Amino acid sequence: LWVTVYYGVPVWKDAETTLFCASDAKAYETKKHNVWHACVPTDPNPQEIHLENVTEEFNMWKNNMVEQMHTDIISLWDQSLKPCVKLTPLCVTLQCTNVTNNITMRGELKNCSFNMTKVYSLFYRLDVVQINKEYRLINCNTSAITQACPKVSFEPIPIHYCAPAGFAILKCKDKKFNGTGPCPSVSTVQCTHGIKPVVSTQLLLNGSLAEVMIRSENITNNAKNILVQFNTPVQINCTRPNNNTRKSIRIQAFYATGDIIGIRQAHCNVSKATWNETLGKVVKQLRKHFNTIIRFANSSGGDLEVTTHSFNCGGEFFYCNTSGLFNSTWISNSITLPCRIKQIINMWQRIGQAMYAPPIQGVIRCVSNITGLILTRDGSTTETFRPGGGDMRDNWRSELYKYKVVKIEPLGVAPTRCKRR
Amino acid sequence: LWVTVYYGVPVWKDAETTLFCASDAKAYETKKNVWATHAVPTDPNPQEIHLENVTEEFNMWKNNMVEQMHTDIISLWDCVKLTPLCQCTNVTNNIRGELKNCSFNMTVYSLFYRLDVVQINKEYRLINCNTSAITQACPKFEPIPIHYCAPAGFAILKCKDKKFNGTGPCPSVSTVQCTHGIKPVVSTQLLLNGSLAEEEVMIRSENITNNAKNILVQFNTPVQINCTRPNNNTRKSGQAFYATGDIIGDIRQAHCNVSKATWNETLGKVVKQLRKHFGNNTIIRFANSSGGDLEVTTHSFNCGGEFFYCNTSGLFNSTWIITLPCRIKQIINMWQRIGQAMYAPPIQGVIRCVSNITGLILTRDGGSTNSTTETFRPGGGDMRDNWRSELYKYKVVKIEPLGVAPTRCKR
Amino acid sequence: GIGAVFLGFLGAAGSTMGAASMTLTVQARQHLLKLTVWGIKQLQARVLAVERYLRDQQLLGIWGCSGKLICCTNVPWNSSWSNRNLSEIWDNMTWLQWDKEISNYTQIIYGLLEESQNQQEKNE
Amino acid sequence: FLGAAGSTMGAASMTLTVQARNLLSQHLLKLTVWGIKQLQARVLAVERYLRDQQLLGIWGCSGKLICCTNVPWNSSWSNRNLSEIWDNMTWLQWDKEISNYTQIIYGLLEESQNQQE
Amino acid sequence: FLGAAGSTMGAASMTLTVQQHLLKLTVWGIKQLQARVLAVERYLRDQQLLGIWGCSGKLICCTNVPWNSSWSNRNLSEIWDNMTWLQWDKEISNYTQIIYGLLEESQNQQEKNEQDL
Amino acid sequence: SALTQPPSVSGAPGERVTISCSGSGSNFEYSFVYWYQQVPGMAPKLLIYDNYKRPSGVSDRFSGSRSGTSASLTITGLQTEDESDYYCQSYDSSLTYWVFGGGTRLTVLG
Amino acid sequence: QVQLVQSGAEVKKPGASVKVSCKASGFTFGRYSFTWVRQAPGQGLEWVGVIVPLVGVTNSAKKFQGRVTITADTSTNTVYMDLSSLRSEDTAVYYCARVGDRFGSGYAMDVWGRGALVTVSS
Ligand SMILES: *[C@@H]1O[C@H](CO)[C@@H](O[C@@H]2O[C@H](CO)[C@@H](O[C@@H]3O[C@H](CO)[C@@H](O)[C@H](O)[C@@H]3O)[C@H](O)[C@H]2NC(C)=O)[C@H](O)[C@H]1NC(C)=O
Ligand SMILES: *[C@@H]1O[C@H](CO)[C@@H](O[C@@H]2O[C@H](CO)[C@@H](O[C@@H]3O[C@H](CO)[C@@H](O)[C@H](O)[C@@H]3O)[C@H](O)[C@H]2NC(C)=O)[C@H](O)[C@H]1NC(C)=O
Ligand SMILES: *[C@@H]1O[C@H](CO)[C@@H](O[C@@H]2O[C@H](CO)[C@@H](O)[C@H](O)[C@H]2NC(C)=O)[C@H](O)[C@H]1NC(C)=O
Ligand SMILES: *[C@@H]1O[C@H](CO)[C@@H](O)[C@H](O)[C@H]1NC(C)=O
Ligand SMILES: *[C@@H]1O[C@H](CO)[C@@H](O)[C@H](O)[C@H]1NC(C)=O
């Protein structure tokens, strides 16, 4: 016999292609200032062509969308800090005073006053460091801080991901799918679901909803972080009960925090019963990989972005304990979390570079979904799972665990019993 | 034999097309907009594929890219439009020459130059207001490489041979996906930041044997020219009539410094090359432009945001077998057109920019005397020739991959 | 648009190679400014897809297939490539399975096609 | 893309495929106008290619690179030794020798295919 | 191709073989670009159609399926000679789907016979 | 802002050993801890970072963890190629200056 | 293949100044950083300084305050350290270590140069 060519038969080969963002019309229209760049709107025509007798070896810890889509955030966020004004000359020998007009806070705020080219300002204990009543910012000299423009905000905006022609996205739809290995239902879609650039540590705020699943590059390994997606959301409401006063100083214009209207610390709240129920569902799912002894201890230590629970709330960035949610021990058979506020923050663990959060006026309140947890197995009594997080990559992997980019080669050959002339 | 078609045969033809610019990545870095830094900022990736045993003749004269790019800069060249159609005294606070200040009423005073203003009949006026409805340009000149990449139907060839002197088959030809750092030299009778050859200085002209057309000269040893603008002035402004403020300090005119030793070495090599194509007996002489307006006689170029009409009387001062003051007026009739101004704002503080002389524009005199001697004089005015010194080793060829030839075959 | 064509070729992946054969012939058949920018990327992607379809067509052109779909060629299939009978190779396998085993020999086959066509036209 | 342009005719006959697949060869507004030039260029490439393809299409080739015909070459379009044609007669000069006859060849080819039909 | 409209098919066949100011420019530049692409894509779909019938960009093709009298038919001479044929489609317009089927079937049987032989 | 280490700890081949790293200052509780393995003549090589993450291509026998205000590096199955100096580093983000521990010496019996 | 090549060993008279250079090996500065660590012979290494070429920010240890100059050049992918007023206390090997990854998101010291040995003797 001989060989024959068939231009068009389905063929796959794993490869990496540069995808492009995808957005919505009304969503794009609602873009005051730059709460987050014009993006292509996608026609709501989800092909979702469910394939039959199909099986492609998905993967999540070697996926290339995560490294891709994380890079998109970095470049976009760098542009969010470009047009704004540097605060290079802003820092000078301060005259802060431990003024406590009201106590909830416990003297967290400071009545800072600088001899600018003589105005007072408020700064929490985090954003200022004592020097030797003289103080200075944590890192202005031998460092670089750029304040965000006051007009812009930082509320997440949903983003879809679509591949160019010649590359198709395979989406796994199996209900039970730990992340690796073959997936039975492989639905081919061009534009994925509403990925959310949620910026948060171990507590995944308001992401996609899952049974609770346990996903890990290697459980036997203590190094890799364990992602747990919740089947049922847990409401979290967290408020800043202080009306902030924004004073503009013509230096360019710095935005100092003026005296607060009437002082209660920012605080988060969690329904203790619902949290207790979900955690049992977690510990019951963990025991599948393991009866045994399970203990939860709070974050062991490290930077303030990991020791606590960092998240964004209406253009303000909160650091709060999680000792009130990870203190338990489980065998086979509302909660309020204290917080802190920081305005000079260096997200993504970058040295030198950092952004100054402009003040936001009034009492700040926000509500979100606790849908995912990041746990770190400790180094055979019990396996204490402390909350880790840290690397910003993981919070993407809780959404992109069910997508891959494949190159299609419609060309193909076959040894058919046929001959040319 | 039978005709058989061939597709993809490497065959091209001499063609003319409107090429597309491909600016470098630094277009937005210096995009203050600048007429030269304007963004197609396509990544200029050069691929110089060499060829073998093939030679074709270029023609730098009567070329297409010479005028194709000439209009491209014009479009890039073309804010507030004044037309100030609606009293002065000599100022000698600290005297070379004397500047002048004109007192006027705006709907004050303005510090002009002697050449910039013309008396009316003391009272002076703007030289360009009565002639035409002049238009002061934007207050907001950085040349940048613009690597030309041909569209997919065309290719750019280069003459890798360094002995090409203007016309004739070049031995080594290498096709070029994207050209080298061609820059807007934008100057008269002198190349600035030009291209350096790697052999003896080269001579080239359309009909060298004749005085009809200009003579183009290549250099190998650059020369540094320093010019300074040490003055401070303010700005006066719906009806934005932008004049100049008072001079803060001494009333000093601009001046320039020119080297001597290197310039002397260059001329001898030029003389030697002229000896090559003229004989070993005739006397070579240098003089001045016994004609032509300020833009032709004076060496005009860009430096520190201002254009200096530097005074080249001293350079062509020789006969064969130190600092030349620059003489500036604010009117910039750069594309030799009645109507345009480019009234550039006066920069504050000294400049002393770094220059790079790489070429000359010389014009022969008449043929009054036979075989005795001839005088070479500075030239310019049509800076079309000015850009011919960068693309002389480049051409665009329309690939015609279809080809036909006979052979003995059937079907 | 050509964009849907490619994953249209991917519509029936698990089907038998025989099944895909007939289905192949069946397969042979400020808001203004923001609207300007989206016009580019929507257009930029589509023209890119066109080049993709031409490149495969041109690749099909070098071999003796012109622009047809179910093409045939007279180059022998040596048993060295996946010795296995023609009976089952069209019913109980899948294209994804087929090429994965072949993926060790794609380039040699394509090269083997080039001169196979090439010799035919000269001595024709 | 040209490659061995001045090489022997026989040399070009081998490398016609050109390595197969390689043969084809204010801020908002400033960024937009740059895109138009880019896209206008690429489509201009495709349109030129198809017209050439269709031009082959009228003839009995339809995109087969080398393609024999049924038109006997008349011994009048400045013919020389057949060996010299594939020994030193390089392609480019071979064009200039033909020059005017291409229109004759184009016209001659058209009728032969039609009378075949 | 549009200019040739309004002529007989004998006349058409021969003619066939030969065949902010910135804001206005940037938007209607896209539309002009938008039309150019739909020229190429619409061309390819036709080429795909002519592919399965057995032509593949031969323009004046041919096929071995007869013209049944069930379709609107007259003396062939008048169709070629005097009948403007922009109106000829109006005759064969509701018959234009089934006839493609016969074109579709003809090639499939033709290749199958070639496949056997 | 000062880190303390044991001077020297030796281990028999094939056994498990641990090394402490205790540093004063509440900032020690607000800053990471790394560990560096350093051949007595060569350049340092990264061993563990972010207190539990192994860089790609490092032996799985290395793993450490935090414990309140101290750090610890644990090695399972010590061989005769693991004798070197081990340095624990605490990157004070606020003050923006790294601090290196004194250096603990490990020797394999043989 | 990613390496931090260095200059050779140096011997300097006390009271002078030393210049040490480090060059990239196939990458630009991008968003990475660079840092310098010195190790006295027979002694645990110690920190010296740090620079971020992307923003041109610097810092150094308190002990070497006013004695160290940290420089960078984006043209040739090189970072030079200029330590002033050498004494016997600075007789040490000086490594230049890379910091971070493709996003500058790290803090560790993963890629290390070979090490330049600066000797101060009388
Ligand atoms: C998931 O992680 C575990 C470790 O937590 C991996 O097990 C490890 O597998 C490696 C080999 O890939 C073992 O290294 C070798 O061990 C043998 C003795 O078993 C030794 O003779 C060799 O010289 C070498 O050291 C390692 O010891 C072993 N560790 C444990 C605790 O099991 C497992 O392979 C990982 N699996 C995945 C998903 O990659
Ligand atoms: C996580 O949980 C641990 C224990 O489960 C908590 O440990 C406590 O950490 C605080 C840190 O401020 C300790 O207070 C400090 O203790 C040192 C000891 O010398 C003292 O010098 C300081 O002045 C300050 O009082 C506290 O003692 C410690 N608890 C106990 C029982 O010792 C930790 O706070 C929880 N949260 C985090 C973010 O680690
Ligand atoms: C995080 O929460 C823990 C406990 O929830 C706080 O630790 C307490 O610190 C005080 C200070 O002396 C001790 O008296 C308490 O005993 C500690 N709690 C427990 C349960 O032992 C810690 O302060 C919180 N984080 C911050 C930054 O304040
Ligand atoms: C820099 O700031 C610190 C306080 O953060 C201060 O102690 C020091 O004197 C300042 N000067 C230097 C060394 O840059
Ligand atoms: C060029 O100069 C020569 C010699 O003077 C003259 O005969 C010829 O006509 C001129 N024209 C050309 C060829 O440019």
Author numbering:
A (entry chain A): 34 to 69, 72 to 139, 150 to 162, 171 to 185, 189 to 266, 269 to 309, 315 to 321, 321A, ...
B (entry chain B): 34 to 65, 67 to 73, 75 to 113, 119 to 126, 130 to 138, 151 to 162, 172 to 185, 189 to 207, ...
C (entry chain X): 514 to 542, 563 to 657
D (entry chain Y): 522 to 546, 563 to 654
E (entry chain Z): 522 to 540, 563 to 660
F (entry chain L): 2 to 9, 11 to 27, 27A, 27B, 28 to 95, 95A, 95B, 96 to 108
G (entry chain H): 1 to 52, 52A, 53 to 82, 82A, 82B, 82C, 83 to 100, 100A, ...
Copied sentences from the primary study:
In the case of Ab1573 complexes, 1 h incubations at 22 °C and 37 °C produced up to ~1 and ~2.6 copies of Fabs per trimer on average. The cryo-EM structures of both Fab complexes with Env trimer showed three bound Fabs that interacted with the CD4bs of each gp120 protomer. The binding sites for Ab1303 and Ab1573 on gp120 were located in an area that is surrounded by three N-glycan patches: the Asn363gp120/Asn386gp120 glycans located near the base of V3, the Asn197gp120 glycan in the V1V2 region, and the Asn276gp120 glycan near the bottom of gp120. In the case of Ab1573, 646Å2 of surface area was buried by VH and 762Å2 buried by VL, composing a total of 1408Å2 of BSA on gp120. Two salt bridges were found at the Ab1573-gp120 interface: between CDRH3 residue Asp97HC and Arg476gp120, and between CDRH1 residue Arg31HC and Asp113gp120. Compared with the Ab1573 and Ab1573 footprints on gp120, contacts by b12 are dominated by its VH domain, with no contacts by VL except for a small region of BSA (340 Å2) on V1V2. A large portion of CD4 binding loop including residue Asp368gp120 was positioned between Ab1573 CDRH3 and CDRL3. The contact residues buried in the closed Env state by Ab1573 also involved only its VH domain, burying a discontinuous 137 Å2 of gp120 surface area. In addition, docking of Ab1303 or Ab1573 onto a closed trimer structure results in steric clashes. Despite Env trimer opening, the gp120 V1V2 and V3 regions in the Ab1303-BG505 and Ab1573-BG505 structures exhibited only minor local structural rearrangements in which the gp120s were displaced as nearly rigid bodies from their central positions in the closed trimer structure. Thus, the Ab1303- and Ab1573-bound Env structures revealed an occluded-open trimer state distinct from both the closed, prefusion and the CD4-bound fully-open trimer conformations.
HIV-1 Env is a homotrimer of gp120-gp41 heterodimers that mediates fusion of the host and viral membrane bilayers to allow entry of viral RNA into the host cell cytoplasm. We characterize Ab1303 and Ab1573, heterologously-neutralizing CD4-binding site (CD4bs) antibodies, isolated from sequentially-immunized macaques. Ab1303/Ab1573 binding is observed only when Env trimers are not constrained in the closed, prefusion conformation. Fab-Env cryo-EM structures show that both antibodies recognize the CD4bs on Env trimer with an ‘occluded-open’ conformation between closed, as targeted by bNAbs, and fully-open, as recognized by CD4.
